[PDB]
Design a protein around this ligand. Structure first.
Ligand SMILES: OC[C@H]1O[C@@H](O[C@H]2[C@H](O)[C@@H](O)[C@H](O)O[C@@H]2CO)[C@H](O)[C@@H](O)[C@@H]1O
Ligand SMILES: OC[C@H]1O[C@@H](O)[C@H](O)[C@@H](O)[C@@H]1O
Ligand SMILES: OC[C@H]1O[C@@H](O)[C@H](O)[C@@H](O)[C@@H]1O
Ligand code: NA
Length: 386
C-alpha cells in the first residue's frame, strides 16, 4: 500500500557508490589509498579505522544533498534505490569497515519525502559476500551462507527494518543485492532467507513491499514464490556489457535485445518486476568497472579473445565530449529501455552520479539532453510494444 507496484510505473535512479563505495564510481577515493585499495573492505583496512571514518564521512556528507533529490523529482522520477552495506548496522568483530552511514540514510529519507520520492532501501552487501563483486564490500570470494553469515545478515536486516519501515517514504526494501546463484549461492537457502526477510518486514510495516533479486536466474523462474500482488516485487538487472554476446552487438541489435528481454522475461513474471538496475552504456570500458586493476571485454583486456573496439573515449569523462551521433545512439538505447521496462512495472537507472563514466551517470545524461524527463519526451519512435 505505500506504492502500488501492481498498477503504477516505477521511475527511479540508484544512489550507487554513496553508502557502499565502488572503485569505478569514485576512483579518486580508491586511488588515493594506493594499489591494494580495490574495494570498501581493503580501502578501510589500509586507511585504518580513524582515517577511514574521516575519508568516508567526507564522501557521505558531500556526495548527496537535498538538491540531488529535487533534481531527481524534476527529471520525472518517483523512486530512489539506495544501496547500504550490512556494516552500516555495526561492523562484525574483525571487519575493517567503519559505520556512520545511517545518519546519512536518515537524511535521504527526509530529502526524498520533501521531493515527493519513494525510497527503496537495498541491502547491497552481506557478511562473507553474496556475489564476490567489489560492490558487495569485498571482492574475490562468495562466503555468504557459510558459518553464521546468514544469521548476521538477518540481524543487520532487522535493525535496518526497525529504523526505516515505519516511514511511508520507504515504500520497499530489498532482501539482498545480486545473490550470485550461478556463483554458488544455494537457491533453497536463499528462499529461506527471503522468507525470513518477509517476516521481518511484516513485523514492522505490512504496507512496505519486499523486493527480491532474481539471483541471475530468469526472473520468471521465481513464479510461484511469494506471489502477492503489490506486496512482493522482483528485481531484475539488465546490462549489455557483462556478456560476450550482448557486448558484440550494434545499436540496432542492442535495442532488439531490450525488447526481447521485456517480452520473454518481464511479461512472463507473475509478480511486479522492476528493472532495478540498467544503464545507458553498451560497453564495459568505464575505468575499474570489472574491478580496480582489471580491464574491459570490449578492448580484449578482460575475459576475452579479441577486441571489439577501443575504450579510450568511453573509459572516463562526461558525455559532452562525445559526438552528436554517439549521444544520439545512447539516447536511442535509453528510450528503448524506458519504453520496454514500462511494459511491466518500470525501472531504476544505475547510477545517479560518478566521477565520469560515459553512459552511466544519470545526472550527466539529464543535463546533456540524453536522458528523457517524462514518458512523452521521445526523440525516436517507440521501439517496444505489448
Ligand atoms: O552479470 C553477471 C556476471 O558478472 C560478472 O561479475 C561482474 C559483476 O556483475 C559486475 O557487477 C562488476 O562490476 O564486475 C564483474 C566483472 O565483470 C561475473 O564474473 C560473471 O561470473 C557473471 O556471469
Ligand atoms: O559493476 C556494475 C554495477 O553492477 C551491478 O550489478 C551492481 O549491483 C552495482 O553495484 C555495480 O556498480
Ligand atoms: O550479464 C548479465 C545479463 O545477461 C543476460 O543473460 C540478461 O538478459 C540480462 O538481463 C543480464 O543483465
Ligand atoms: Na514503509
Amino acid at each position: 500500500s505505500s506504492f502500488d507496484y501492481n498498477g503504477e510505473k516505477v521511475r527511479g535512479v540508484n544512489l550507487g557508490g554513496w553508502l557502499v563505495l565502488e572503485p569505478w564510481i569514485t576512483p579518486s577515493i580508491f586511488d588515493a589509498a594506493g594499489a591494494e585499495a580495490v574495494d570498501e573492505w581493503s580501502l578501510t583496512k589500509i586507511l585504518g579505522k580513524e582515517e577511514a571514518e574521516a575519508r568516508l564521512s567526507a564522501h557521505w556528507k558531500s556526495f548527496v544533498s537535498a538538491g540531488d533529490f529535487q533534481r531527481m523529482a524534476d527529471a520525472g522520477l518517483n523512486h530512489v534505490r539506495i544501496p547500504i552495506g550490512y556494516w552500516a548496522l555495526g561492523p562484525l568483530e574483525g571487519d575493517p569497515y567503519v559505520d556512520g552511514q545511517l545518519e546519512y540514510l536518515d537524511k535521504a529519507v527526509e530529502w526524498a519525502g520533501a521531493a515527493g520520492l519513494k525510497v527503496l532501501i537495498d541491502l547491497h552487501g552481506a557478511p562473507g559476500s553474496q556475489n564476490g563483486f567489489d560492490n558487495s564490500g569485498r571482492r574475490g570470494a562468495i562466503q555468504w551462507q557459510q558459518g553464521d553469515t546468514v544469521e548476521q545478515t538477518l540481524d543487520a536486516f532487522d535493525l535496518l527494518a526497525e529504523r526505516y519501515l515505519g516511514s511511508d517514504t520507504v515504500a520497499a526494501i530489498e532482501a539482498i543485492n545480486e545473490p550470485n546463484i550461478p556463483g554458488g549461492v544455494d537457491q533453497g537457502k536463499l528462499q529461506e532467507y527471503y522468507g525470513s526477510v518477509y517476516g521481518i518486514v511484516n513485523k514492522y510495516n505490512a504496507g512496505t513491499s519486499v523486493v527480491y533479486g532474481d539471483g541471475f536466474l530468469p526472473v520468471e523462474s521465481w513464479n510461484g514464490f511469494k506471489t502477492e500482488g503489490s506486496k512482493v516485487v522482483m528485481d531484475t538487472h539488465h546490462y549489455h556489457m557483462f556478456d560476450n554476446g550482448l557486448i558484440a552487438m550494434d545499436i540496432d541489435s542492442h535495442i532488439d535485445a531490450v525488447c526481447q528481454f521485456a517480452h520473454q522475461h518481464l511479461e512472463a513474471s507473475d509478480k511486479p518486476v522492476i528493472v532495478g538496475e540498467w544503464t545507458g552504456a553498451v560497453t564495459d570500458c568505464a575505468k575499474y568497472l570489472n574491478g580496480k586493476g582489471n580491464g574491459a571485454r570490449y578492448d580484449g583486456s578482460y575475459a576475452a579473445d579479441k577486441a571489439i573496439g577501443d575504450c579510450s573515449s568511453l573509459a572516463t569523462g562526461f558525455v559532452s565530449k562525445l559526438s552528436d551521433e554517439e549521444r544520439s545512439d545512447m539516447r536511442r538505447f535509453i528510450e528503448a529501455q524506458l519504453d520496454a521496462f514500462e511494459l511491466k512495472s518500470g525501472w531504476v537507472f544505475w547510477t545517479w552520479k560518478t566521477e565520469g563514466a560515459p553512459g552511466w551517470d544519470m545526472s550527466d545524461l539529464l543535463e546533456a539532453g540524453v536522458f528523457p524527463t517524462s514518458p512523452d519526451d521521445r526523440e525516436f519512435p517507440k521501439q517496444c510494444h505489448h
